[PDB]
């Protein structure tokens, strides 16, 4: 999404349930691999936040 082509919006968004596995990105998808600071990238698929 190119809507947030600025710095003031911030999109003010919240997620209710995110149960998308990390390995699903290999199903012919062209999405860049997630990079996480302070925690290993796979922690999204392992633990809760």
């Amino acid at each position: 999404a190119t809507r947030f082509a600025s710095v003031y919006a911030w999109n003010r968004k919240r997620i209710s349930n995110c149960v998308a596995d990390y390995s699903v990105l290999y199903n012919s998808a062209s999405f860049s691999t997630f990079k996480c600071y302070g925690v290993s990238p796979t922690k999204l698929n392992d633990l809760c936040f």
């Epitope: 691999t33 990079k35 996480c36 600071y37 302070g38 925690v39 290993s40 990238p41 796979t42």
Partner: nanobody
Framework: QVQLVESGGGLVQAGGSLRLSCAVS????????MGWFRQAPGKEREFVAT????????LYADSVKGRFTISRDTAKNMVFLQMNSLKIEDTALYYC???????????????????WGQGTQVTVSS
């Protein structure tokens, strides 16, 4: 100015294999997170690869995706980067992962690390 010391350097045979390990101990990569990056001739910065604690998937750089490999050991407490199928274009200074500001994490961006001190000069030619 002082320059970072890394294993290797000098002329490297094309298509060979070499190891890249940091030698300095004042600012180890572990403090800022294990990783490696190289500066191409001029003022261009790029990322090569890094090893994640999971050990199941390694963050690969699109430029060298599927080329470089990293070995892992339980008690060595060190990370060694191994290069495969070297090319003439690989000629570039190699730097140890260091950040100008305090931070910790894993990432796959070219501008992840940068420092004033120059790195080991590696020349690759046929």
């Amino acid at each position: 100015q002082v320059q970072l010391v890394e294993s290797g350097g000098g002329l490297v045979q094309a298509g060979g294999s070499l190891r890249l390990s940091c030698a300095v101990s004042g600012r180890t990569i572990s403090t800022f997170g294990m990783g490696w990056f190289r500066q191409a001739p001029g003022k261009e910065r790029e990322f090569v690869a890094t090893i994640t604690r999971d050990e199941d998937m390694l963050l690969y750089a699109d430029s060298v995706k599927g080329r470089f490999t990293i070995s892992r050991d339980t008690a060595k407490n060190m990370v060694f980067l191994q290069m495969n199928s070297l090319k003439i274009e690989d000629t570039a200074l190699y730097y140890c992962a260091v950040r100008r500001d305090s931070s910790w994490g894993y990432s796959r961006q070219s501008t992840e690390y940068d420092y004033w001190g120059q790195g080991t000069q590696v020349t690759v030619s046929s």
